[PDB]
Design a protein around this ligand. Structure first.
Ligand SMILES: [Ca+2]
Ligand SMILES: [Ca+2]
Length: 310
DNA sequence: TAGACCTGGAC
DNA sequence: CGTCCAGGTCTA
């Protein structure tokens, strides 16, 4: 009881709720769907990971999101900590209102969405998001997930251990910008991305002004933020869009990848107007198409289709 | 605008 | 067992 990952049943007194119907959130459709790679369903229906520098286990009932934190002296989460959870899930943003708007302007969205509710965007930490996706280029969720964990185990601060799992906080810029980081990352299997991580860490601290420069992007415009991001090695148009969408508060950002193309072609008979294949210009066009169709929160809209495809 | 590219399940 | 493919990016 006192050990291992908790469950709602095992330690009732250590949990606290946040009103939240499954219609507004589905942990199982959000946490493992390629937004964040830090959560694992350690026991059925319970998800554990690092959120706001601490470890949490989350699980949900029909109307409640149950939370528990592992900071000593175990106790339920405090209202402020819970606030950190609400912020992470952007619970002030109402999915029902978004699904409704999207559905009214797109019959296809209407269909699919009725079977995949509660898909929303996580508000991620800029650093974690930047380097997580630096690792995602030309790669799959399973691998990316492993790489990211190895990364944090090797360069992130040790937080706490549960069962045989040791949680780590995400690596700081300083640690990632350190000597021989690349060589160490290659031994960990990040492939050529190993250089990207190192180079982008150095690029930020040594040529852009450090952490501040990145955080500033949240107040910056989507177009600005996206442009800024693109100078960093390993970060192309797609990765940048993922970051603007998931960390820089750019909900109109639409990351186009092979997934997006297939769906665009199959479900909307979409084809390039202004090349006939996947390239900078055609990708830019596809993103505008979905933006013109769905509106200001097109990015959220695509997540519904992206994490509903299979 | 065509490959070159780390890695490991899936074909 | 060689060939693909994954939330692509980068370069003659
Ligand atoms: Ca591909
Ligand atoms: Ca770049």
């Amino acid at each position: 009881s006192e050990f291992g990952h908790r469950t709602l049943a095992s330690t009732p007194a250590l949990w606290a709720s946040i009103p939240c119907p499954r219609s507004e959130l589905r942990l199982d459709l959000v946490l493992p769907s390629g937004q964040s790679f830090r959560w694992r369903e350690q026991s059925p229906a319970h998800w554990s990971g690092v959120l706001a520098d601490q470890v949490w286990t989350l699980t949900q009932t029909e109307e409640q999101l149950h939370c528990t934190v592992y900071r000593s002296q175990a106790s339920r989460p405090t209202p402020d900590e819970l606030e950190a959870v609400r912020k992470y899930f952007q619970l002030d943003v109402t999915l029902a209102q978004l699904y409704h708007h999207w559905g009214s302007v797109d019959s296809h969205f209407q269909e699919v969405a009725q079977k995949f509710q509660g898909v929303r965007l996580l508000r991620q930490d800029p650093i974690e998001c930047l380097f997580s996706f630096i690792c995602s280029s030309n790669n799959n969720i399973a691998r990316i997930t492993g790489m990211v964990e190895r990364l944090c185990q090797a360069f992130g601060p040790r937080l706490i251990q549960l069962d045989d799992v040791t949680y780590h906080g995400f690596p700081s810029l300083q640690a990632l910008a350190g000597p021989e980081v690349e060589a160490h990352l290659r031994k960990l299997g990040l492939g050529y991305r190993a250089r990207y991580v190192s180079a982008s860490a150095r690029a930020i601290l040594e040529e852009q002004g450090g952490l501040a420069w990145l955080q500033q992007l949240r107040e910056s415009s989507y177009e600005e933020a996206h442009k800024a991001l693109c100078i960093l090695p390993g970060v192309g148009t797609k990765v940048a869009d993922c970051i603007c969408l998931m960390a820089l508060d750019k909900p109109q950002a639409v990351p186009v990848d092979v997934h997006m193309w297939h769906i665009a072609q199959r479900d909307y008979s979409w084809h390039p107007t202004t090349a006939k294949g996947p390239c900078p210009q055609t990708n830019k066009e596809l993103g505008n198409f979905f933006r013109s169709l769905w509106g200001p929160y097109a990015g959220w809209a695509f997540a519904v289709l992206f994490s509903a495809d299979l």
